[PDB]
Amino acid sequence: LANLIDYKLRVLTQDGRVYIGQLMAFDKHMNLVLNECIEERVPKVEKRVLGLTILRGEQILSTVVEDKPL
Amino acid sequence: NGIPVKLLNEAQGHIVSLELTTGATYRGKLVESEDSMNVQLRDVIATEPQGAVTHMDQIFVRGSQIKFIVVPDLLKNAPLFK
Amino acid sequence: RARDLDLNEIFTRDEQYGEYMELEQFHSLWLNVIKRGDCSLLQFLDILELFLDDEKYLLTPPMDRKNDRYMAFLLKLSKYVETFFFKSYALLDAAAVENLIKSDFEHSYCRGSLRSEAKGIYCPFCSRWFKTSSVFESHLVGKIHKKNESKRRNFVYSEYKLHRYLKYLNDEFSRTRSFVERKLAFTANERMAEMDILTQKYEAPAYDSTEK
Amino acid sequence: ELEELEEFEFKHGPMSLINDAMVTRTPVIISLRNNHKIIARVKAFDRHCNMVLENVKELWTEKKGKNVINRERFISKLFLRGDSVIVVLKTP
Amino acid sequence: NTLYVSQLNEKINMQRLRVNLFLLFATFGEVLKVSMNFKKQRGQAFITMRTIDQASLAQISLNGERFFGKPLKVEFSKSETKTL
Amino acid sequence: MKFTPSIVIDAPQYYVDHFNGKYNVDKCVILRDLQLETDSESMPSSLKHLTKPTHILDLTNNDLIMIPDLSRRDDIHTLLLGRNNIVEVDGRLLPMNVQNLTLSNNSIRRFEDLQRLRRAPRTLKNLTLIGNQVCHLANYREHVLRLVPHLETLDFQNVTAEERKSAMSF
Amino acid sequence: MVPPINCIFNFLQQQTPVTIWLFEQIGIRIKGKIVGFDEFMNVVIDEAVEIPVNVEKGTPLGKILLKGDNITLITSA
Amino acid sequence: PVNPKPFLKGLVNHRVGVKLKFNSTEYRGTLVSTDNYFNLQLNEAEEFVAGVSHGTLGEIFIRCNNVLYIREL
Amino acid sequence: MKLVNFLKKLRNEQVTIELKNGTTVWGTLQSVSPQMNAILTDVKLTLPNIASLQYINIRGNTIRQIILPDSL
Amino acid sequence: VSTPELKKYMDKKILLNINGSRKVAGILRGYDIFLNVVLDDAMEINGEDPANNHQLGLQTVIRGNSIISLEALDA
RNA sequence: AUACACAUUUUUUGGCAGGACGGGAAGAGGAGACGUCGCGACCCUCGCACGAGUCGUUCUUGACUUGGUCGCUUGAUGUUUCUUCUUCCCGUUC
Ligand SMILES: [Zn+2]
Numbered sequence A: 001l002a003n004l005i006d007y008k009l010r011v012l013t014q015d016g017r018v019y020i021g022q023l024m025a026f027d028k029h030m031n032l033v034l035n036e037c038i039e040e041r042v043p044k045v046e047k048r049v050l051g052l053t054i055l056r057g058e059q060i061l062s063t064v065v066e067d068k069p070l
Numbered sequence B: 001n002g003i004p005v006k007l008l009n010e011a012q013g014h015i016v017s018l019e020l021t022t023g024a025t026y027r028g029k030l031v032e033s034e035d036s037m038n039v040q041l042r043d044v045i046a047t048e049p050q051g052a053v054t055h056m057d058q059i060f061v062r063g064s065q066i067k068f069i070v071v072p073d074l075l076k077n078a079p080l081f082k
Numbered sequence C: 001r002a003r004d005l006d007l008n009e010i011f012t013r014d015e016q017y018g019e020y021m022e023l024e025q026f027h028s029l030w031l032n033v034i035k036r037g038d039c040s041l042l043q044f045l046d047i048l049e050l051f052l053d054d055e056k057y058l059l060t061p062p063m064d065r066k067n068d069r070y071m072a073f074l075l076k077l078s079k080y081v082e083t084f085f086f087k088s089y090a091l092l093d094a095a096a097v098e099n100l101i102k103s104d105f106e107h108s109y110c111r112g113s114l115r116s117e118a119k120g121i122y123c124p125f126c127s128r129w130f131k132t133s134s135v136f137e138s139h140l141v142g143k144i145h146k147k148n149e150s151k152r153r154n155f156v157y158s159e160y161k162l163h164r165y166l167k168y169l170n171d172e173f174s175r176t177r178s179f180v181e182r183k184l185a186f187t188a189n190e191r192m193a194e195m196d197i198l199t200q201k202y203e204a205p206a207y208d209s210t211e212k
Numbered sequence D: 001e002l003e004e005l006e007e008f009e010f011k012h013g014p015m016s017l018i019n020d021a022m023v024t025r026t027p028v029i030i031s032l033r034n035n036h037k038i039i040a041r042v043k044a045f046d047r048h049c050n051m052v053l054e055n056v057k058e059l060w061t062e063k064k065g066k067n068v069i070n071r072e073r074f075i076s077k078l079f080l081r082g083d084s085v086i087v088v089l090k091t092p
Numbered sequence E: 001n002t003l004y005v006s007q008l009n010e011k012i013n014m015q016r017l018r019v020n021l022f023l024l025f026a027t028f029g030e031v032l033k034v035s036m037n038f039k040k041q042r043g044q045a046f047i048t049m050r051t052i053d054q055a056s057l058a059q060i061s062l063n064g065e066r067f068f069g070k071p072l073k074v075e076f077s078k079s080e081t082k083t084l
Numbered sequence F: 001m002k003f004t005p006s007i008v009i010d011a012p013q014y015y016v017d018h019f020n021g022k023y024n025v026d027k028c029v030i031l032r033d034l035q036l037e038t039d040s041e042s043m044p045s046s047l048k049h050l051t052k053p054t055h056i057l058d059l060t061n062n063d064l065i066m067i068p069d070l071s072r073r074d075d076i077h078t079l080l081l082g083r084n085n086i087v088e089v090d091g092r093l094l095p096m097n098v099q100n101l102t103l104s105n106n107s108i109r110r111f112e113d114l115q116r117l118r119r120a121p122r123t124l125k126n127l128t129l130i131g132n133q134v135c136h137l138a139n140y141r142e143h144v145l146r147l148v149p150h151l152e153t154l155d156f157q158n159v160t161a162e163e164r165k166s167a168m169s170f
Numbered sequence G: 001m002v003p004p005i006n007c008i009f010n011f012l013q014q015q016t017p018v019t020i021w022l023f024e025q026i027g028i029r030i031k032g033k034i035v036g037f038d039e040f041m042n043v044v045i046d047e048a049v050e051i052p053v054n055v056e057k058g059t060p061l062g063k064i065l066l067k068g069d070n071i072t073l074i075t076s077a
Numbered sequence H: 001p002v003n004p005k006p007f008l009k010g011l012v013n014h015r016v017g018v019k020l021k022f023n024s025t026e027y028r029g030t031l032v033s034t035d036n037y038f039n040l041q042l043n044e045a046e047e048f049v050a051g052v053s054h055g056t057l058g059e060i061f062i063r064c065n066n067v068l069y070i071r072e073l
Numbered sequence I: 001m002k003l004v005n006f007l008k009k010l011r012n013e014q015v016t017i018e019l020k021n022g023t024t025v026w027g028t029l030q031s032v033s034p035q036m037n038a039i040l041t042d043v044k045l046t047l048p049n050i051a052s053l054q055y056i057n058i059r060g061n062t063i064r065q066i067i068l069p070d071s072l
Numbered sequence J: 001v002s003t004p005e006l007k008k009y010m011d012k013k014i015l016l017n018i019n020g021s022r023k024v025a026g027i028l029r030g031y032d033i034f035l036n037v038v039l040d041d042a043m044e045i046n047g048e049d050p051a052n053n054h055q056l057g058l059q060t061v062i063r064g065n066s067i068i069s070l071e072a073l074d075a
Numbered sequence K: 001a002u003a004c005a006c007a008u009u010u011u012u013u014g015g016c017a018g019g020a021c022g023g024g025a026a027g028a029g030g031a032g033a034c035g036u037c038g039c040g041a042c043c044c045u046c047g048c049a050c051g052a053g054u055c056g057u058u059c060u061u062g063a064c065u066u067g068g069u070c071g072c073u074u075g076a077u078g079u080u081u082c083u084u085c086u087u088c089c090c091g092u093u094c
Helices: B003-010 B073-077 C024-034 C041-052 C068-088 C094-107 C133-137 C143-151 C153-168 C170-184 C188-202 D002-012 D016-024 E014-025 E052-061 F005-009 F112-119 F140-147 F161-169 G004-014 H004-011 I003-008
Strands: A008-012 A018-025 A032-040 A047-055 A062-067 B015-020 B025-033 B039-047 B053-061 B066-070 D027-032 D037-044 D051-062 D069-080 D085-090 E002-006 E045-048 E073-076 F056-058 F078-080 F100-102 F126-128 G017-021 G028-037 G043-052 G059-066 G073-076 H015-020 H026-034 H040-049 H052-062 H067-072 I013-019 I024-032 I038-046 I050-058 I063-067 J013-018 J022-031 J037-045 J051-055 J060-062 J067-072
Touching (some): A018 B003, A032 B003, A047 B003, A047 B073, B015 B039, C024 C068, C041 C153, C041 C170, C068 C153, C153 C170, C170 C188, D016 D027, D016 D037, D027 D051, D037 D069, D051 I003, D069 I003, E002 E052, E014 F100, F112 F140, G004 G028, G004 J022, G004 J060, G028 G059, G043 H004, G059 H004, G073 J051, H004 H026, I003 I024, J022 J051
Parallel strands (some): F056 F078, F078 F100, F100 F126
Antiparallel strands (some): A008 A018, A008 A062, A047 B066, A062 I050, B025 B039, B053 J067, D027 D037, D037 D051, D069 I063, D085 H052, E002 E045, E002 E073, G017 G028, G028 G043, G073 J060, H015 H067, H026 H040, I024 I038, J013 J022, J037 J051, J037 J060
C-alpha cells in the first residue's frame, strides 16, 4: 500500500459509489485521505468534485491504480 | 493513533462536510473530533437524500456512523506529505 | 520481428508449453454433467481413453450420446484438445491437417467406416447398425437419418475431431496421466516443491544469461 | 497453560463439529449468508470458522421467468472466509 | 509568465470560464494554472504559463480578442505567481 | 516527424491544470495526451499507444491537414487543435464524449466542410472555429447552429434560443 | 444522570416488565422481565413475548437469552 | 446474579430452540455445548422456517453472531 | 492455526475470489495482508462485462471466499 | 477505552436519531465508554406524526452502537 | 538497514430478498414537490492580488490573528408517490 502513495487511485465504496483521488496517507483501519478527490456514480455522468476527503476503512471495498501522481 | 486521525484533529475549528451511513450531509464548523471519529459540529446545514435541507445548532454524530468527511484544503500543505 | 511474442498468453502453467494438458477443469465440468461425485480425476481420464479407440467412444459411451449435457461437454472438450494440438505444434500446417481430417470424415466415417462381421454397418448419427451395405445406403436418404444428420451434425463432427486429435496426442495424454498419478502419490512438501518447479518453469526467461 | 485451555475448550465446545469433521474427513454442509450452501470435506478450520474445503459442491437457488430452479457447481479447492458461515451441519 | 486579463463577461460560470481560457491560451504554450484563485470572475483572471515567450506571445496576439461577447484586456501581472 | 509510438512514450506527461489526465508523446517530436505542440505533426496516427488514459490532447502548432485516423478513445474529452492547417474533418470521428474541439486558426474554407461536426452526438458542447476563413462567409454562425445544435457555446459565445430560432427560419 | 448498566441493574431489582427495541427491526419487539445480564448485555428475560406491531399480537416464548447485539433500546412498561 | 452464561450452562443437555436474527430459520434440538463466545452446538436438530418444519438436520453448529435469542422448549 | 498465514504462502498464485458483495475477481496474488487484504496483479474483475486492471487491492473483510488451484 | 466528552450535553434535551429511521427525544441522563445513553422523559416520535411518552421519569437506555446521531435542542 | 488484530466507533458483517437499435421533431389516446450545480441578462458590481492581514530578521522565511438574483423562450441530477402507437430525417450492425 505504501507503494501506492501519492498515486491517483480509484476506490470502490461499500455503497457502490466510485471515488477517485490522490492517496496521501493510510492507517491501520485503512482510513484513507484522498486529495483532489472526485466522485463518479453510474460509470462521465454524475461526477462531483469533493476535494480533500477521508474515507473510512470500514466502507472501503477495493482500490486500483488510476493514474500516476501529480 | 492514525495519521488521518491526526489530520482530522487538525481540522477542528474549520468548516467540514460529513456524510453518514444514512446519506444525510452535515456541513458546519467542527468543534471537536475524538480518536473514535465522534465529531461535535456547529451551525450545521443538513441536506437529506430526498433533497430537503434543515438547519441545526449543535450536532454530535458517532464515529462509526460516518461514511466520510471533506475538510478544507488549507491542511493539504503539511505535515502529512512526509 | 516478434518482440512482443509471449507463450504464457497461449499456454497455461499446468500445460508447461505442451508437456501436459490440463484436464482437471474438464473433470469438474464432468462432475457437473454426471450429477454425482463417484468419478475421480483418474476415472475421468479412464473415460477419456475411450476416445483413443476407433470404436469404444462410439459403442461404449460414458453417457448416452443423445444426452444434452454430455454433447455440450464433448463439444467444449473437443475444441480444447484441438486448439491445444495446434498450439503445441505451430510448425505444422494447420489447414492441411484440418482438411485431411474433414475429408476422412466425409469419405470414410459417414460412409460406413465402422463395420462389424456380425451386426454390419454402424451409423454415428442414428446410433444403429445395419445388416448389409444395401439397406445402409437406402437408410441414408430416409427421413430419420436426414433429421439426425441435420440436427446432430456438428456434435458428431466434434466427437470425431476429439477422437483423431486425441490419437495424435497419445504421448501427451499418457504423459499427463502419469503426472496425475505422481502428484497424487506425493506428500504435502513434495507436492509443494513440485508446484514450485512448474511455476519456475512457467515464469522463466526462454534464454538465460548463462547459455552456450 | 493458556494455550492448553484454549485447545481443550475448542475440543469440547461447539467447534467439536468442525474438529470431528477434519479428523474423520467427513462431509459437512454449510449454510452461508449468500443463500448458497457448501457440502465438502474440512481440510482446515479456524477460530473465525475460516476454512479450507475440498471436494466442494455448492448448491443454490435461482429464480427465472418460470419455476424456481436449483443450481450447483463443483469447486475442488475452496478457501472460505469465517463470517460467511451461518451454520455448519454435520450429518451421516 | 503570468498574464492578468480583465474586461470579461462575468456571467459565465467559473469552471466554464477556466476551461475556455485554458483552451484559448493553450495555442501559445502550456498553461500551468489549474483554476482561478481570485474566485471573483469580472474578467480578473490570471493565466500562468510555463515559458515566458508564450506569455508574451499570448499578450501581443490576443489583445482585445472577442471572448464571450467582450474584447479582453490583457496585461502582465504585477507580481509573480505563487506556483512559479 | 511522424507521430509514432516511440514518440508516444516519453513526452512531458502530466495532469492538466484542470486536473485532466494524460500521458504525452515525445521521443523527438509530436505529442499526444497533453502537449502535442511544436513538432510538425503532418498526419495524426498511432493513437493506440495512447491506450486511452487521456482527457485532453493539445495538438496546437503542428502541420495537420485533416482530422482523421482517430482510434477509439473513450477518455478523450478535449482537443486543442490550434495553429494547424486543418482543411477537412473526417466524419466518422465519433470519439464518444468529445466535449470540446478547438479549431482556432486553421484553414477550413466551406460550410459543408463543417458538416461532419454534426456527427458528434450530444457531447460536443464547446467548439471554437475563430481564425478560419469559413467564419467570414455569410450566415456562418446560424449555419453552425442549425448543423450542430449540440453545441452550447460557439466561438466562446453562447448559442441562445433567439439565433436557434433564426437558424430554423433559414 | 446514571450509567446505563446501573439503569439495567435497577430494572433487575425492580423486576419491571421490559420492552426491547431490536436492531434494524421495527416490526417486532420483545418484552419480559430481566432476571440477569452480563457484560455483553446479553439478557436472560423471563416470560418473554414477541410483539409484532403489524392492536398488537405476540408469541409467548417463556425464558429467553437474548443477545445484546440486537438490543437497540431497552425500556420499561 | 444469574448470568446468561450460567442460565445457558443449566440449559445444556436440554431441548431448546434458537431464533436467529433473520427469523428465516429457527433450530430446535438438544443443546450439546456452547463456548465462551457463545457459538451453539445442537443435536437432533430440526429446522423451523416460517414456523413450519423444514426438515431434520441433526448435529448442527450455529455461528454465535446469527443468534437472536435462545429459548428452552 | 491461523489460516491467514496459509494465505500469506499464496503469493504468485492465480485465484478466483468471490466477494461478499457478489463480485468475482480473477488474478495472481502478489501478497495478502494479515487482514487478509489481498493485492493482486493482472486481474480481470466482474462486478454483479469484465474490467481489466493492472493491480487490485481488496479489504480482507469483504472477501467471501477464494478459489485456489486444484494443483495446490 | 475512551470516554465520549458528552458532559457538555448532560441534563440537556436532545433529539437522538437511531438506525431503522427511528427518532426519540429526551433529556441526556448518563453515558458510558460504550456511548450507551440513559435518556429521561423519553418520547418516541413515530413515523406517522404522534409521539408516545415511553419513559417520562422511568428513563430508557439506548445502545451506543445503535445511536446514529444526537442533536442538541438547547444551547 | 537488519504476544496480539470474532462481543458496541473500523477487518471476522444486520444482512438477505429489406430488418433491428439509439437520437430528434410532429400528430393522436410522462406529470407534481423538495432540494443541489449550469445557457442568457435588461442586472448587480469595478478591480493584481491572493487564502488574506500585520511584525522579527535578512536577500528570503518563523510567529500571531480570522458569483448573488431573475428567466430556460422546452439546462443538467438524486429522493419520493401515482398511472403506448404511426410518419419523416440522421448514425451503427447484418
Ligand atoms: Zn443414420
